[PDB]
RNA sequence: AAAAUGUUUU
RNA sequence: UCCUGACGCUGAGGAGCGAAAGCGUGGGGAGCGAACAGGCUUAGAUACCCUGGUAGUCCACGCUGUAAACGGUGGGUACUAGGUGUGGGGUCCAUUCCACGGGUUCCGUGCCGUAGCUAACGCUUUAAGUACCCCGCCUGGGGAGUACGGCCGCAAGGCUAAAACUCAAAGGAAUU
RNA sequence: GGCUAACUACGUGCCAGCAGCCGCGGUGAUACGUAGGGUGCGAGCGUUGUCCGGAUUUAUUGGGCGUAAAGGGCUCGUAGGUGGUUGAUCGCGUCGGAAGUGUAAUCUUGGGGCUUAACCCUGAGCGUGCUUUCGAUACGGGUUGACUUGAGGAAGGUAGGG
């Protein structure tokens, strides 16, 4: 969208990237100024990239959308969360693990015994009595569950799109991604790689609301998406 | 290398310097 | 690791000169490591064959010993 | 998918996985799959009816199937070699080649049309 | 030193393709920039141009752009040298090769000037096997 | 600290 | 900047150089140290270990011409992501009107690493990648780099180099 | 027995024997011997010898040399192989016609004859070359002239247990 052009990006600081020591060679056309070590985006093709992103997300809400946010940065931890919610679209916060897109069988088992158990485990918790390091240990595999799943509940089947958010620590989901040939969009700096994301999103990485603008004005148009969906019906 | 390659060839190696030290003398009186 | 250690200007050498080769000779009477004296390359094999020569000549200990 | 022009190979391949080099080459019709019997299998499987299969290299039944499969990945059928050279199928292919697909494919609607 | 400037330009269009650019160049000689032109005109490069030396001013590049499909696909599926300088291949007439079964193209250089194997067949003449490019 | 060896079943 | 104007590359045979040990004549000989002697250990100990100790190690002039002489990777050339140390020559910049510093360029020398290659290990702009030119070399393991012959050498030996016979393996990397 | 189309019983007991390779026989042998049954061929069927193939296992087509067999210990350098850009010219290589030749038989193929076939006759092709002659000049080469980017040199700078 508009997103105020460049201004907002100016002044919330997307043009920072990453200095010398590490850099992937795909960059060389993404080049601004070397301004300090940190390298520079011109955040100028970012407003057409992210638009295009926006033009591939009403496409995919349109043919009916499930866009999967995973996020394991400390960055994002508390940005993508929130916002999923409010959307109600799924997403993955802790510990993206080994699996779940290609280990579906066992994460939908995994699915089905969470939601019989945060019913079973409270009924029995608040009715009949039970000894400690059962219950004890039942609600703490509980937790577990719900600290390492949580808007991963919500998919009757594979999804239709990945969100990523810094690749670099998030890489298995790509791979996991590319496999399955599920659609990619993801947050790339000057390090990351275009070959393995289809529509991709220029920018900085590392700030807490860097990635926080891009993960909400995308929830903006998954609940924009999902509203016309009651037409597209 | 397995290191037995040179020491099979270790052995006829010293097994033939061995059998030239042994028949030096013969050799120069007759022969090579 | 050897960049903290700045590198260090000594201009003509001159083994004559027993101030600098004092200041990159050890306690004991050596000469010190390149990673310690913070030269150069070519500086370092300067300060070395100085002292070397002042050595022979009698400008300067062979070893210091007792301190 | 394999490019078949009509029961048969687009154009000779040369794949090799490993050590396992495969050779095909198309064969004219009635020519039979002459393959050994890994690449044979493949070449079946794929519904090649008249190809040349020469195993070059290991003989391990695992390294020649990927031979012949990457061999078989190397087909180019002819619509996409023309969209590769932005031209046209006949002005980039064999007459013969292109004329046997038209036989070839007449051939099949008759067997359609019969079923 | 240089001895096949000829494979020298198909190695260095090899390369550069494979390894994505857009655009690669080379010194110019007259034989590279028909070879070239040829390559254009079958639709293998995006396009080529001789331009006159300014930064060695010393003599002509031949600079040729190569041309990559939807989905970065590549346009060249392969080129070889045939008529090797440590020894030349010359074909009649009757027995001009044949490249990926009529796919690809023969480079054949001959009397009446570079010609593609189909060229060739077409004004009955042979030459020397230049290059296969497919 | 030196401290060797291990026939022929069917 | 200047000069010549393809004069380049490789190179069978040939020639030279070629660690150490060794050989010849003469010199030298501290330390070290084959051989050797003794002491220990041991079933034995022609060994390890200890005490002695000659050639040799050193010098001069020759000879020998072989090494895991290995990067186990022939030379030349062009092209094909980077990242990061370090050695050498320039040149540029700011403060200097030194140098600290940064760049940039040409030539080395390491490490990481993409494409690519490889059986794998790994190699990867210093290729084991993509190519072209020339040379050496390989064709199962033993027998055998041995015999016969010839050449070289003072000698030790080196170089060139088989066959009969025999086995159905020998081998490479990696897995448990 | 597997490659390899086709299996059981009895006898034997590492014996007698089999085998092209892997191997079989030591008490339940589809592997020895016999029998029934079966399979492949058939006036033949096996064995031996020899050659080519498979063998890309001498790799021109069509392989390799870090560790599997394989880079000379290293360099210099002779013959040889190889050659940056370009003008002109020759037309040896190369390419295209023409003529001559490549007997016949064979071989491929079209017709014909033996009742069919083998075989036989006949037309054509092939005879992959060579000679003569007329063309073409892109490339290789010869002759000849330029160019400086490869190469070497000059001047200055310069590092080093050469
Ligand atoms: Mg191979
Ligand atoms: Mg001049
Ligand atoms: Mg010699
Ligand atoms: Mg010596
Ligand atoms: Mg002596
Ligand atoms: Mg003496
Ligand atoms: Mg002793
Ligand atoms: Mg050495
Ligand atoms: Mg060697
Ligand atoms: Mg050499
Ligand atoms: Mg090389
Ligand atoms: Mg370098
Ligand atoms: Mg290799
Ligand atoms: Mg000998
Ligand atoms: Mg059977
Ligand atoms: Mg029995
Ligand atoms: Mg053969
Ligand atoms: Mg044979
Ligand atoms: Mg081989
Ligand atoms: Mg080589
Ligand atoms: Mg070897
Ligand atoms: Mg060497
Ligand atoms: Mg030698
Ligand atoms: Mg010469
Ligand atoms: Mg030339
Ligand atoms: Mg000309
Ligand atoms: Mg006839
Ligand atoms: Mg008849
Ligand atoms: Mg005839
Ligand atoms: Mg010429
Ligand atoms: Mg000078």
Redesign the pocket.
């Known amino acids: 969208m508009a997103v105020v052009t460049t201004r907002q990006l100016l002044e919330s600081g997307v043009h920072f990237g990453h200095q010398?020591?590490?850099?992937n060679?795909?960059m060389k056309r993404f080049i601004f100024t070397e301004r300090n070590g940190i390298y520079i985006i011109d955040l100028h093709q970012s407003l057409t990239y992210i638009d295009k992103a926006y033009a591939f997300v009403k496409e995919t809400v349109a043919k009916g959308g499930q866009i999967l946010f995973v996020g394991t940065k400390k960055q994002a931890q508390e940005s993508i969360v929130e916002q999923a919610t409010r959307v109600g679209m799924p997403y993955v916060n802790q510990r993206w693990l080994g699996g779940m897109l290609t280990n579906f069988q066992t994460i939908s088992k995994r699915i089905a015994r969470l939601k019989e158990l945060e019913a079973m485990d409270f009924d029995k918790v608040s009715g009949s009595g039970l000894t400690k390091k059962e219950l004890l240990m039942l609600s703490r595999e509980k937790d577990k569950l719900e600290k390492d799943l949580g808007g991963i509940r919500d998919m009757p089947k594979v999804p239709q799109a990945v969100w990523v958010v810094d690749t670099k620590k998030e890489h298995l989901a790509i791979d996991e991604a590319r496999k399955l040939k599920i659609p990619v969009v993801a947050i790339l700096d000057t390090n990351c790689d275009p070959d393995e994301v289809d529509y991709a999103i220029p920018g900085n990485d590392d700030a807490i609301r860097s990635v926080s603008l891009l993960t909400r004005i995308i929830a903006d148009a998954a609940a924009e998406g999902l509203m016309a969906r009651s037409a597209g019906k | 290398?397995?290191?037995?390659?040179?020491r099979?060839?270790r052995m006829?190696?010293k097994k033939?310097?061995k059998l030239?030290?042994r028949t030096?003398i013969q050799?120069?009186r007759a022969?090579? | 690791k050897?960049?903290p250690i700045?590198?260090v200007?000594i201009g003509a050498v001159d083994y004559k000169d027993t101030a600098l080769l004092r200041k990159f000779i050890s306690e004991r009477g050596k000469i010190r490591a390149r990673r310690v004296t913070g030269l150069?390359?070519?500086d370092q094999?300067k300060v070395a064959i100085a002292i070397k020569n002042a050595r022979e000549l009698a400008l300067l200990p062979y070893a210091s010993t007792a301190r | 998918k394999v490019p078949l022009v009509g029961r048969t190979i687009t154009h000779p391949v040369i794949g090799?996985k490993?050590?396992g080099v495969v050779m095909l080459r198309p064969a004219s019709p009635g020519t039979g799959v002459i393959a050994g019997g890994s690449a044979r299998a493949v070449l079946e499987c794929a519904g090649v009816h008249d190809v040349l299969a020469k195993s070059?290299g290991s003989s391990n039944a695992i390294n020649v199937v990927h031979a012949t499969v990457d061999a078989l990945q190397q087909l180019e059928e002819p619509e996409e070699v023309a969209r590769r050279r932005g031209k046209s199928v006949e002005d980039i292919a064999p007459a013969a080649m292109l004329r046997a697909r038209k036989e070839a494919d007449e051939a099949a609607a008759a067997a359609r049309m019969e079923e | 030193?240089?001895?096949?400037?000829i494979?020298?330009m198909?190695?260095?269009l090899?390369?550069?393709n494979?390894?994505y650019?857009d655009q690669?160049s080379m010194?110019?000689?007259?034989?590279?920039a028909?070879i070239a032109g040829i390559l254009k005109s079958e639709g293998y490069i995006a396009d080529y141009k001789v331009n006159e030396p300014k930064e060695?001013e010393?003599?002509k590049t031949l600079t040729l752009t190569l041309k990559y499909g939807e989905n970065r696909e590549r346009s060249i599926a392969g080129v070889?040298?045939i008529?090797?300088?440590?020894?030349?291949v010359?074909?009649?007439?009757?027995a001009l090769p044949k490249v990926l079964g009529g796919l690809g193209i023969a480079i054949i250089?001959?009397?009446?000037?570079?010609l593609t194997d189909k060229q060739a067949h077409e004004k009955?003449?042979?030459?020397?096997v230049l290059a296969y490019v497919w």
């Open positions: 010398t020591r590490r850099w060679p795909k | 290398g397995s290191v037995i390659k040179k099979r060839k006829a190696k033939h310097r030239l030290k030096r050799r120069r022969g090579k | 050897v960049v700045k590198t200007h150069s390359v070519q094999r | 090799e490993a050590a070059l | 030193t240089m001895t096949d400037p494979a020298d198909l190695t260095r090899r390369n550069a494979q390894a650019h690669t010194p110019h000689s007259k034989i590279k028909g060695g010393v003599g070889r040298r008529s090797k300088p440590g020894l030349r010359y074909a009649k007439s009757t250089s001959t009397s009446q000037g570079l009955s003449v042979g030459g020397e």
